[PDB]
Enzyme design. Structure first.
Site, PDB file in Angstrom:
ATOM      1  N   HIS A 433      38.343  51.501  46.290  1.00 43.29           N
ATOM      2  CA  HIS A 433      37.464  50.362  46.071  1.00 43.29           C
ATOM      3  C   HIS A 433      36.171  50.926  45.518  1.00 43.29           C
ATOM      4  O   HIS A 433      35.573  51.804  46.142  1.00 43.29           O
ATOM      5  CB  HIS A 433      37.175  49.620  47.381  1.00 43.29           C
ATOM      6  CG  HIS A 433      36.246  48.449  47.223  1.00 43.29           C
ATOM      7  ND1 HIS A 433      36.663  47.221  46.753  1.00 43.29           N
ATOM      8  CD2 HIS A 433      34.922  48.321  47.483  1.00 43.29           C
ATOM      9  CE1 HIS A 433      35.635  46.385  46.746  1.00 43.29           C
ATOM     10  NE2 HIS A 433      34.568  47.028  47.186  1.00 43.29           N
ATOM     11  N   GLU A 546      46.521  46.423  40.470  1.00 41.35           N
ATOM     12  CA  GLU A 546      45.404  45.941  41.254  1.00 41.35           C
ATOM     13  C   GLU A 546      46.013  45.373  42.541  1.00 41.35           C
ATOM     14  O   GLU A 546      47.107  44.789  42.507  1.00 41.35           O
ATOM     15  CB  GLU A 546      44.703  44.851  40.452  1.00 41.35           C
ATOM     16  CG  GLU A 546      43.477  44.234  41.057  1.00 41.35           C
ATOM     17  CD  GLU A 546      42.774  43.334  40.057  1.00 41.35           C
ATOM     18  OE1 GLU A 546      43.399  42.359  39.586  1.00 41.35           O
ATOM     19  OE2 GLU A 546      41.602  43.610  39.734  1.00 41.35           O
TER      20      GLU A 546
END
Ligand SMILES: [Cl-]
Ligand SMILES: [Cl-]
Ligand code: NA
Ligand code: NA
Length: 599
Positions: A433, A546
């Site tokens: 992240h 993703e």
């Protein structure tokens, strides 16, 4: 007469005549205790039996307890205009244990904790109330820990000659080997010998205390406190904090964004000088307050920030506050927006204006259980669900913090140790992240929290990527700061309990695809958005993957720093593959995700 000796007469059992008016007992503790140079907790307790359903008890005017058989109301504090107030609804009939904790030590919290244990016939602990916090200020705490009076009077009793039976009245002290983190969390129970085993059972995990309190020493100072056998309901440990002057959403946001105790914001006197308090805590608190005072709805946060940044001198106080700290403002306002939205959707009885002042209910949530729910009485409160965070998985090596110069005291060696600790605790790596410095601080230390996002509701959640190069693109400021400079951010590693893996799914479709929504719902087995589940798929046709974690799942992640640095000299540039440590790559393969719905 009116007086009685609580600790001498009621240590075993006493029956107090209440027919002639209030009864009182001085509670004196050796002053040498409240003046200790170390740190400790005084645990005051007593078991109330027959007559406990028609009472008004008090400790000076600092704490009042009213019991009528249906509820146990608490109120008190040092501040004169807005009493701290709580109400616990009884879950059983019969005896109940009254408990209050007074901290001692030079840098002690300025509040007390109060909690109730309901007991069954077998004298076993059957139910436990939330842990309630009441602000006292330093001087009143000192008085409560040395000389205060306990008052007992019948209240709306149906008895012709009311009496109150008390047993196991007493006070103990636990001295640590200054650390006060447990005091504000569910681990406060780990400091109390009288409640050994409760935290492990309810949190579904060991206390695992740091050395300070791990090496504590316990002593009974007066009376004879009870140590009840357990037959407790699996209800998660909860705390409740009432904000008499309002401002709860602002305090909750500051605490979560900055990693500062929630109760620091309810203090009688504001601490001064503290770096994180002056730079993050108060600024964030003020920002949320300004937004609320501007009478703006939370669904317009993005436009409000956009307009404040686009036009100097605009927006007034709120606009200036935003322009003063662009990214910190974005973090704060989107955190508050998400929590207010959740609060409003909890019941027709809640609205945006109420979210600003509602009590905060904090839950100690087991990582493996399903969704973490609070008490039935918590529907009118702001909620916080707490799980282990990166703060617990950094290992040795010194303080960790985020800066444009790199993550403080973070090396490949330290990362490998942390990764091993995570594996030992049952966690597994699921991706990277990238984000800005202030958000990295919030996420790693305070834990991941929902934030409003300008995207379709069905796709809201925490965005990560197995490929560090895709996450790297998001690891920077999205808007220049007050000094007009786009700072590099930080790349973080996201872990989840292995027990959560069955909720991770994958698709070959891109989320923009019209078939996406329905296919993902087919896979997860319920309507979007994601809950305790996740989806992985191409970010675009022929693109890198993703992963979106539903917010409930995101909250139980553990996030730690990557050893892959962001390049301050090339902000906005692509990740240079040669900068990825080979040893970090070796611990970065991703799990095998489900491509079909559960059978
Ligand atoms: Cl009274
Ligand atoms: Cl390496
Ligand atoms: Na009653
Ligand atoms: Na009072």
């Amino acid at each position: 007469e009116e007086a009685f000796d609580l600790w001498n007469e009621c240590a075993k059992a006493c029956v107090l005549d209440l027919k002639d008016g209030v009864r009182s007992s001085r509670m004196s503790v050796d002053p040498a205790i409240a003046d200790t140079n170390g740190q400790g907790v005084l645990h005051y307790s007593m078991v109330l039996e027959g007559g406990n359903d028609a009472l008004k008890l008090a400790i000076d005017n600092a704490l009042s307890i009213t019991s009528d058989g249906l509820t146990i109301r608490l109120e008190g504090g040092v501040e004169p205009n807005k009493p701290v107030r709580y109400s616990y609804t009884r879950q059983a009939r019969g005896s109940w244990s009254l408990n209050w904790l007074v901290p001692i030590g030079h840098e002690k919290p300025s509040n007390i904790k109060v909690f109730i244990h309901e007991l069954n016939a077998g004298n076993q602990l059957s139910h436990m109330s939330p842990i309630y916090t009441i602000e006292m200020g330093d001087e009143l705490l000192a008085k409560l820990a040395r000389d205060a009076t306990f008052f007992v009077r019948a209240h709306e009793s149906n008895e012709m000659q009311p009496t109150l039976a008390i047993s196991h009245a007493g006070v103990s002290v636990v001295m640590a080997q200054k650390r006060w983190s447990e005091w504000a969390s569910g681990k406060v129970l780990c400091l109390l010998d009288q409640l050994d085993g409760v935290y492990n059972y309810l949190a579904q995990q060991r206390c695992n205390l740091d050395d300070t309190w791990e090496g504590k020493i316990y002593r009974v100072l007066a009376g004879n406190p009870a140590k009840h056998d357990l037959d407790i309901k699996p209800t998660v440990i909860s705390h409740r904090l009432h904000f008499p002057e309002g401002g709860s959403l602002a305090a909750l946001t500051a605490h979560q964004a900055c990693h500062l105790p929630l109760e620091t914001f309810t203090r009688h006197r504001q601490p001064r000088g503290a770096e994180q308090l002056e730079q993050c805590g108060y600024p964030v608190q003020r920002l949320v307050a300004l937004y609320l005072a501007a009478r703006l709805s939370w669904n317009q946060v993005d436009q409000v920030i956009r307009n404040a940044l686009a036009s100097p001198g605009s927006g007034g106080d709120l606009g200036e506050a935003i322009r003063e700290q662009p990214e910190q403002a974005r973090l704060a306002l989107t955190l508050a927006a998400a929590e207010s939205e959740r609060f409003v959707r909890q019941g027709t009885g809640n609205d945006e204006a109420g979210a600003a002042n509602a009590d905060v209910v904090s839950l100690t949530c087991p990582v493996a259980a399903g969704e973490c729910a609070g008490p039935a009485d918590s529907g009118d409160a702001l909620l916080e669900r707490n799980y282990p965070t990166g703060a617990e998985f950094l290992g040795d090596g010194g303080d960790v913090s985020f800066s444009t110069r790199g993550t403080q005291n973070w090396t490949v060696e330290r990362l490998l140790q942390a990764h091993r600790q995570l594996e030992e605790r049952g966690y597994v790596f699921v991706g990277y992240h990238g984000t800005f410095l202030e958000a990295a601080q919030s996420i790693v230390f305070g834990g991941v929290r929902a934030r409003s996002q300008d995207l379709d509701a069905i796709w809201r959640g925490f965005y990560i990527a197995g490929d560090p190069a895709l996450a790297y693109g998001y690891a920077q400021d999205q808007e220049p700061d007050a000094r007009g400079r786009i700072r590099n951010g930080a790349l973080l590693r996201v872990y989840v309990p292995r027990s959560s893996l069955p909720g991770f799914y994958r698709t070959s479709l891109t989320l923009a695809a019209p078939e996406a929504a329905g296919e993902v719902e087919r896979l997860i087995g319920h309507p979007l958005p994601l809950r305790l589940d996740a989806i992985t798929g191409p970010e675009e046709e022929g693109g890198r993957l993703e992963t979106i974690l539903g917010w409930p799942l995101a909250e139980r992640t553990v996030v730690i720093p990557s050893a892959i640095p962001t390049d301050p000299r090339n902000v906005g540039g692509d990740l240079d593959p040669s900068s990825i440590p080979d040893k970090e790559q070796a611990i970065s393969a991703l799990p095998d995700y489900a491509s079909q719905p559960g059978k």
